[PDB]
Amino acid sequence: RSTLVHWFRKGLRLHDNPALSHIFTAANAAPGRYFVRPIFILDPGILDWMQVGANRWRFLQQTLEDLDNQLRKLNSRLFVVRGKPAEVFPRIFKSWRVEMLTFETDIEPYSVTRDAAVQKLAKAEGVRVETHCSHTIYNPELVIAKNLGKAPITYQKFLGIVEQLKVPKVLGVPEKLKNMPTPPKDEVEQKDSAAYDCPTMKQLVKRPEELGPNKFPGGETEALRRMEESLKDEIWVARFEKPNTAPNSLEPSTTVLSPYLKFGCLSARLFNQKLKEIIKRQPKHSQPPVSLIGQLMWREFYYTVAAAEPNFDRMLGNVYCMQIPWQEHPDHLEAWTHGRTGYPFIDAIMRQLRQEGWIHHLARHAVACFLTRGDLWISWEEGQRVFEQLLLDQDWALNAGNWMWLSASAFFHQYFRVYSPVAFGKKTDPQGHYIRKYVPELSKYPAGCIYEPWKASLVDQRAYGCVLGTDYPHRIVKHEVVHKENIKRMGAAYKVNREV
Numbered sequence: 001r002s003t004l005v006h007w008f009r010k011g012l013r014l015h016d017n018p019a020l021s022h023i024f025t026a027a028n029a030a031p032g033r034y035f036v037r038p039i040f041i042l043d044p045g046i047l048d049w050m051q052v053g054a055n056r057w058r059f060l061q062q063t064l065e066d067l068d069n070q071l072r073k074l075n076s077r078l079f080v081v082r083g084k085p086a087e088v089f090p091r092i093f094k095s096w097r098v099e100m101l102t103f104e105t106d107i108e109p110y111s112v113t114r115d116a117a118v119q120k121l122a123k124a125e126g127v128r129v130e131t132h133c134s135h136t137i138y139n140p141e142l143v144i145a146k147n148l149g150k151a152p153i154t155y156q157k158f159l160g161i162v163e164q165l166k167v168p169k170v171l172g173v174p175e176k177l178k179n180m181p182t183p184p185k186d187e188v189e190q191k192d193s194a195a196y197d198c199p200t201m202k203q204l205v206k207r208p209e210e211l212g213p214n215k216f217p218g219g220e221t222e223a224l225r226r227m228e229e230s231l232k233d234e235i236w237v238a239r240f241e242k243p244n245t246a247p248n249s250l251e252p253s254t255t256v257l258s259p260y261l262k263f264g265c266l267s268a269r270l271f272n273q274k275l276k277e278i279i280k281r282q283p284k285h286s287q288p289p290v291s292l293i294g295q296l297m298w299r300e301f302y303y304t305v306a307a308a309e310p311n312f313d314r315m316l317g318n319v320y321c322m323q324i325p326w327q328e329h330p331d332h333l334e335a336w337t338h339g340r341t342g343y344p345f346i347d348a349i350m351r352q353l354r355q356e357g358w359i360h361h362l363a364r365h366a367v368a369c370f371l372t373r374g375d376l377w378i379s380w381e382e383g384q385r386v387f388e389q390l391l392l393d394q395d396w397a398l399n400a401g402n403w404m405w406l407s408a409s410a411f412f413h414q415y416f417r418v419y420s421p422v423a424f425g426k427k428t429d430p431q432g433h434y435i436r437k438y439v440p441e442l443s444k445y446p447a448g449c450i451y452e453p454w455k456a457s458l459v460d461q462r463a464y465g466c467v468l469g470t471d472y473p474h475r476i477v478k479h480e481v482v483h484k485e486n487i488k489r490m491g492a493a494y495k496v497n498r499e500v
């Protein structure tokens with residue numbers, strides 16, 4: 001008896017999962033010949049390549065538990081294998097007599113490298129590998145082909161390409177496994193009946209004092225519930241315009257499906273299909289780029305440009321990226337990283353990010369503009385790394401692509417438009433309720449100076465119980481001065497890049 005293996009990496013779902021569906025149908029169309037091992041590998045190698053903060057570890061822990069729970073409802077289970085894929089797969093290919101291995105493809109360079117190796121090993125041991133592109137709606141390889149070998153570098157050109165592509169068929173959940181025995185323990189399972197059980201919170205979260213509020217629980221079950229809740233107001237869905245959603249409402253103004261889409265707890269193909277059904281029903285609706293479908297297409301757009309560029313997450317060697325002489329300023333980077341810049345709006349966003357792991361798109365604009373071209377003139381690569389640590393929805397392509405946009409390094413070139421860290425929040429939160437929540441030491445400042453506490457006299461600062469320089473920091477830079485200087489620096493950088 002030989003085993004069929006589905007390998008979860010992203011695609012942490014049962015629904016719309018061709019790679020997992022195929023394994024299950026095969027076992028049921030040939031009962032008694034096959035064992036089924038759906039596995040997730042806790043790969044120590046990823047940690048040399050990315051930073052993972054406490055909140056995202058908890059999201060993953062919750063996700064694996066949910067996935068295990070869901071697979072048990074199909075008379076299977078999740079097997080979580082600790083170890084490096086390069087060492088894990090030779091062992092299990094033999095110990096399990098693996099006939100077929102399936103998985104969902106991914107475009108990240110670490111994935112491409114790791115997957116090539118596993119495919120060279122699988123080819124040697126005569127294991128059939130079947131892969132499916134279901135993390136994105138469109139296959140970036142096909143978008144690039146249709147555009148004659150280059151990724152489209154504007155959203156509009158990208159949309160014109162993908163309109164002519166076939167939308168994939170969205171699958172349901174696999175059928176339960178008919179009359180399948182629990183596979184026989186292997187070398188590892190026999191010395192430890194739990195060697196493959198889902199990690200506990202304690203095993204994955206080494207810094208539990210860094211966990212914030214548990215607001216967006218991991219897993220497909222929660223993803224589908226949140227999707228269904230977001231889709232209940234069909235008018236809100238149909239008429240959604242991303243630029244008009246508030247970054248500093250106390251409740252999120254957008255769907256917060258991004259963590260679920262990042263891990264593939266939610267199929268983007270399913271979400272796209274559900275959105276299209278509502279749009280069909282609601283004749284007055286928005287269009288890309290600002291519509292909700294438009295948002296999924298931004299994800300597709302960045303996945304496509306990123307697929308063509310292994311250096312997408314760095315300035316050097318990145319075909320898209322303007323070479324800009326960013327400066328090193330460790331103290332300013334640290335103040336930004338910890339929300340101690342002395343601009344309350346910026347600090348509120350960075351504290352929400354650290355505590356909760358999600359901030360709105362335009363809140364990400366504000367802080368990324370401040371770090372890079374707007375104020376501190378620090379490389380977007382530094383911002384990317386902090387976001388990588390703190391965001392539940394950390395996504396190699398999306399983080400890099402939007403950082404390049406916000407820093408005017410690629411895709412966006414109107415660097416003379418600079419967010420103000422004082423004025424920008426006021427449009428949608430003139431009372432500063434968001435600042436009061438995340439910078440509570442300012443909570444007694446009136447609306448007239450809560451965005452600009454340095455405009456309060458010392459007497460009033462003492463009265464409000466928050467003296468600048470003691471209880472809340474002084475501004476680390478004066479926006480009105482530095483952002484004018486940075487516009488000149490950017491223009492110089494654009495000139496140099498144009499001459500090369």
Ligand SMILES: Cc1cc2nc3c(=O)[nH]c(=O)nc-3n(C[C@H](O)[C@H](O)[C@H](O)COP(=O)(O)OP(=O)(O)OC[C@H]3O[C@@H](n4cnc5c(N)ncnc54)[C@H](O)[C@@H]3O)c2cc1C
Nearest residue numbers: 254255256257258295296298299361364393394395399402
């Ligand atoms: C500096 C910076 C870094 C970012 N890093 C990430 C990241 O690491 N991971 C991430 O998922 N998004 C990232 N984004 C994009 C965007 O801000 C988030 O996708 C969005 O805030 C998710 O919130 P939401 O799910 O409520 O989005 P909604 O507005 O409800 O959109 C639905 C989905 O569309 C996609 N989407 C929406 N906006 C964008 C966008 N601008 N680019 C790409 N896809 C988009 C996401 O999958 C999102 O879940 C970043 C943006 C900026 C400016």
